[PDB]
């Protein structure tokens, strides 16, 4: 054999190669004299068909094609959190430093993590020579960042008996931290492990998901809750705010780490995250710190080679599963899923595999399914018991804003949360543009067991919110044909409170100090006051309409105009300056003001 | 350094099929290299090798394949990809869709031979665009602000004056030196004269460059026509630190050149038969807008596209919609009422506006004024849609005030002369004189402090 074959032909991202006998499908191979990274996608004899994760312009017939025996894989270890990686896991900070140029050179050989930086390693202190150790066992802690402790773990395939463990100190990626013996064979390990991106990191069990994923946004938190470990999609037309939700989860959520994956996304977006996230700060133990210290960015912008989008998604989930095995509540923003389906389309077009719908390959449903099913809460591998999760949030982007698109259709067959973004709300600058009739959350039953521990009133309020919106949407089918004239007073109350809920609860101005994030207490408080107004206003009319002294919806509006203004004002409360106690007290004043005004109408 | 090895020339055409000539016996074909073709009649042509396999090379010909001959055609392989000769001296000049001069000047004496494709800008090095450009037009500078280094297209219905708006931006845009690059794909002769004449009348010739592919020119040149503009913009911006506004006229005629090539190659279709890769091809154009680290330069793009049958869900506007930082949109609902520039604010947005709006860049209120103008104009459209069914008798007094706001708004905010220049500050004073139509308590998007300072003025 030859360790390398030779390029037989090229067509966009696809390269065919001769003398590739003895190559595995999904083996990583380097193509061209410049070593363009690619992966074998079909075998045809001694010929292999390769998918190249870099632009193939300039590849020549007879250029070298070096085999590696290894699939596309991530170096997992210290130096991930706060870094940014391209779609094939090369760190862009080092690329800038080594190249001094505004461009990513094709065929860059940079290591996925810095091998020269020294890291503080604390061994687990329970391990000794002769201790039995298994995949996912934690052999130490690295102080990677002030927020994130990197619990280095035995690779999931590995098993053995501890033969050497390094003492406490400072070490690098080449320093052997652990050595094992098993079955008469030795293994040497550093603080870095290599894992195949297409392979799921195994777990002890996939656990039930029963804790809310708290987010920046009122309607997501309250009306369509996500769960930690849940699968979510955000199907939405262009300009609808799919990206504002994705950063709202990233900037402001209860997740322990965030993996942000700019798959096929405009380049200014990854720059926006890289600029804004080091300035934005969360707080731990009364110490303020940059949210970049808990974030990891996978970049693969809209103008980078389409094949690297598949590599980007699988890289981003591989990273996310690693932090999950460290016992963290991981969150993954998949900033575009149809951009991945387009990469699968273009490659399948060069392979001439028959298309299913809209030109997408028939395996798209399995590609998306096997991606989203890597989400979950899990009991982690290896000695110390941990529980962690990956939540996956897929920003599906259907062409023409039509949810019948096959990427959306296949996604909604899998995911358990649907935040459908409506272009008609986005046009009116109603953001978040989530359509509350279209959207669903399937995790609500699993979360009611949590809501009862902290907010017994919440399930009543969520139910009444949907009733108000449903009655208004049904009344609107009459109003559109007859105008605002024929409605009953109860119907006008329903219409106007649904508009209050739309304008002042469902809308949230994510670019302002008061609406940048909305803690859950403000969420239940605002909704409680608006539904309290609804119940009291309804009771007032329904009690008095039986007699000459009938209360009207106009009489309520006119006599209680200051209350309607106060209810609308509730968004402007600043979570940093108005303390939780002060917000609850102000909202209790609104409750009493309503009660006194309705008692004056009675 | 330079390729010293002598070029091969082949007569070994083994087929011709639509726009593709299939060479054979080719020694080590290089994918995407350029080929110079000489026809039997001595006519010179150019092409790019869009597939390779062993001894074969499938060259697509830019000038089309009429008169290619399977025995006499000579194909000189250059051994390298399509490079644009670039230099500072490309300012003050006009080139065709393949970068050949048409101003009767000489060839471009190059300072470098940049790749037509450029390279992906490193996301680590991409500086965020936030410094505000004033275009001079209130419907842009007020509700759809443009950053230095943004890409933001004008979407138009067919026959609308989008050319006049793009001219007005090149005529009056500036900061709160802007060189210009202009490309056009499938442009009609009268419109080519319009843009060329506008730059000559405005006198800004020594700092503009034009690439013109007319509707009678070969369609395949349209693939490289915007890439030439961008490759010149990358030289001027990133190597010479200039700021550039890059205009891409008729991205629909570009996309039709892709639809033609796609259909002629049997490529996998997306919606309306555009190629499945259309998003990435458009991204390789659009994403070259931006600032970059340690260079004072910036490429800003204003693409222009006429939507087929005015359908916003059409693949051309729709994929552009996903890639660019929001949209400027022009509408028959304004144009038919003589409301120049006919910029409908509701379908319009700017993704980079939020970062550009704020203190020092603009008046501190600007973000809030925008937010409330959108709300009032949106309600105004919805109450108009109601009134058309039911008359004023089923509208409230407040709904009739939003209908009156819509009339006052279009006549003062959007309506603006083809040489009338307005700063953002005058636009915001106009915005407040419109917002004052409602009582203070109705302005539900604006914080109480902003209202208390500005509402009574």
């Amino acid at each position: 054999e030859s360790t390398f074959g030779y390029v037989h032909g090229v067509s966009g991202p696809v390269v065919t190669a001769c003398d590739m006998a003895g190559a595995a499908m999904y083996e990583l191979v380097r193509v061209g004299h410049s070593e363009l990274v690619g992966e074998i996608i079909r075998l045809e004899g001694d010929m292999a068909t390769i998918q190249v994760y870099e632009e193939t312009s300039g590849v020549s017939v007879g250029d070298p094609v070096l085999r590696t025996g290894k699939p596309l894989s991530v170096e997992l270890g210290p130096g991930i959190m706060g870094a940014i990686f391209d779609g094939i896991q090369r760190p862009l900070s080092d690329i800038s430093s080594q190249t001094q140029s505004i461009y990513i050179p094709r065929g860059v050989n940079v290591s996925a993590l810095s091998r020269d930086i020294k890291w503080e390693f604390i061994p687990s202190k329970n391990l000794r020579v002769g201790s039995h150790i298994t995949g996912g066992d934690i052999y130490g802690i690295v102080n990677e960042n002030s927020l994130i402790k990197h619990k280095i773990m035995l690779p999931p395939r590995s098993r053995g008996s501890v033969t050497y463990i390094a003492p406490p100190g400072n070490y690098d990626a080449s320093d052997v931290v652990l050595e094992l013996e098993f079955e008469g064979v030795k293994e040497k390990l550093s603080m870095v492990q290599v894992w195949p991106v297409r392979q799921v990191r195994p777990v002890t069990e996939k656990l039930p998901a029963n804790h809310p994923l708290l987010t920046g946004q009122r309607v997501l938190d309250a009306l369509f809750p996500c769960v930690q470990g849940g699968t979510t999609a955000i199907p939405g037309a262009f300009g609808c705010g799919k990206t504002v939700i994705s950063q709202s989860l990233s900037k402001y959520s209860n997740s322990d780490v965030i993996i942000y994956v700019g798959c096929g996304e405009r380049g200014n977006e990854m720059s926006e995250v890289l600029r804004d996230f080091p300035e934005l700060t969360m707080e731990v133990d009364g110490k303020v710190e940059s949210i970049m210290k808990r974030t990891a960015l996978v970049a693969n912008t809209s103008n980078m080679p389409v094949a690297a989008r598949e590599a980007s998604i699988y890289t981003g989930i591989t990273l996310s599963e690693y932090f999950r095995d460290m016992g963290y509540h991981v969150s993954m923003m998949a900033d575009s899923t149809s951009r991945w389906a387009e990469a699968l389309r273009e490659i399948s077009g060069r392979l001439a595999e028959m298309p299913a719908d809209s030109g997408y390959p028939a395996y798209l449903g399995a590609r998306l399914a096997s991606f989203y099913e890597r989400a979950g809460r899990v009991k982690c591998l290896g000695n110390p018991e941990r529980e962690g999760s990956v939540s996956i949030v897929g920003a599906v982007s259907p062409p023409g804003g039509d949810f019948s698109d096959p990427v959306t259709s296949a996604t909604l067959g899998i995911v358990q949360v649907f935040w459908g973004l409506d272009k008609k709300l986005a046009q009116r600058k109603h953001f978040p543009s989530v359509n509350w009739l279209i959207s669903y959350s399937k995790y609500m039953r699993a979360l009611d067991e949590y809501y009862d521990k902290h907010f017994t009133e919440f399930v009543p309020l969520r139910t009444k919110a949907k009733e108000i919106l449903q009655e208004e949407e049904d009344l609107a089918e009459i109003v559109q044909l007859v105008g605002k004239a024929s409605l009953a007073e109860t119907d006008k109350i329903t219409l106007e409170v649904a508009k209050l809920i739309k304008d002042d609860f469902l809308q949230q101005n994510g670019y302002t100090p008061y609406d940048r994030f909305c803690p859950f207490y403000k969420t239940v408080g605002m909704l409680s006051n608006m539904i309290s107004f609804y119940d009291m206003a309804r009771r007032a009319v329904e009690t008095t309409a039986q007699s000459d002294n009938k209360i009207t919806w106009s009489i309520i509006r006119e006599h209680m105009g200051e209350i309607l203004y106060k209810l609308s004002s509730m968004k402007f409360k600043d979570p940093v300056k108005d303390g939780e106690a002060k917000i609850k007290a102000d909202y209790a004043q609104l409750l009493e003001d309503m009660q006194n005004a309705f008692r004056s109408l009675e | 350094n330079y390729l010293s090895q002598p070029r091969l020339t082949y007569k070994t055409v083994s087929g011709v099929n639509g726009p593709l000539v299939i060479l054979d016996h080719v020694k080590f074909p290089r994918y995407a290299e350029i080929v110079h073709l000489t026809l039997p009649d001595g006519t010179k042509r150019s092409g790019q090798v869009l597939e390779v396999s062993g001894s074969k090379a499938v060259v697509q010909v830019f000038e089309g394949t009429s008169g290619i001959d399977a025995k006499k055609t000579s194909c000189e392989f250059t051994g390298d990809i399509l490079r644009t000769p670039v230099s500072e001296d490309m300012l003050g000049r006009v080139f065709n869709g393949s970068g050949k001069p048409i101003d009767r000047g000489p060839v471009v004496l190059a300072e470098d031979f940049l790749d037509i494709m450029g390279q992906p800008i490193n996301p680590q090095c991409r500086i965020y665009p936030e410094e505000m450009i004033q275009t001079g037009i209130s419907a842009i500078d007020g509700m759809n602000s443009i950053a230095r280094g943004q890409k933001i297209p004008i979407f138009s219905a067919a026959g609308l004056p989008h050319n006049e708006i793009a001219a007005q931006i090149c005529r009056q845009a500036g900061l709160v030196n802007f060189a210009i690059v202009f490309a056009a794909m499938g442009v009609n002769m009268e419109t080519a004269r319009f843009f060329k004449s506008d730059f000559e009348e405005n006198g800004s010739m020594d700092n503009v460059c034009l690439f013109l592919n007319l509707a009678n020119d070969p369609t395949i040149e349209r693939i490289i026509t915007p890439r030439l503009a961008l490759t010149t913009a990358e030289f001027l911006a990133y190597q010479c630190e200039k700021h550039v506004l890059v205009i891409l006229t008729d991205m629909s005629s570009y996309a039709e050149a892709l639809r033609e090539v796609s259909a002629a190659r049997e490529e996998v279709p997306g919606r309306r038969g555009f190629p499945g890769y259309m998003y990435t091809d458009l991204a390789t154009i659009y994403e070259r807008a931006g600032r970059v680290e340690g260079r004072n330069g910036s490429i800003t793009q204003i693409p222009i596209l006429t939507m087929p049958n005015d359908d916003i869900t059409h693949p051309i506007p729709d994929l552009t919609g996903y890639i660019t930082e929001g949209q400027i949109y022009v509408d028959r609902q304004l144009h038919n009422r003589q409301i120049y520039p006919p910029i409908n604010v509701l379908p319009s947005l700017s993704r980079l506006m939020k970062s550009a709006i704020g203190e020092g860049m603009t008046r501190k209120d600007h973000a809030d004024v925008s937010n409330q103008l959108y709300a009032c104009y949106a309600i105004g459209k919805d109450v108009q849609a109601m009134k058309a069914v039911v008359g004023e008798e089923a509208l409230t007094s407040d709904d009739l005030l939003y209908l009156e706001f819509l009339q006052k708004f279009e006549k003062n905010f959007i309506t603006q002369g083809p040489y009338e220049n307005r700063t953002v500050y005058e636009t915001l004073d106009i915005g407040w004189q419109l917002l004052r139509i409602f009582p203070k308590e109705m302005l539900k998007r604006i914080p109480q402090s902003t209202l208390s300072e500005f509402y009574p003025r």
Partner: peptide, 23 residues
């Protein structure tokens, strides 16, 4: 149309290969 054009192309290739294998 696209699916059927690809089917017809595959048949054309299989016809040609079947003739070439008899030479």
């Amino acid at each position: 149309f696209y699916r059927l054009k690809k089917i017809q192309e595959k048949k054309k290739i299989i016809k040609e290969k079947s003739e070439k294998d008899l030479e």
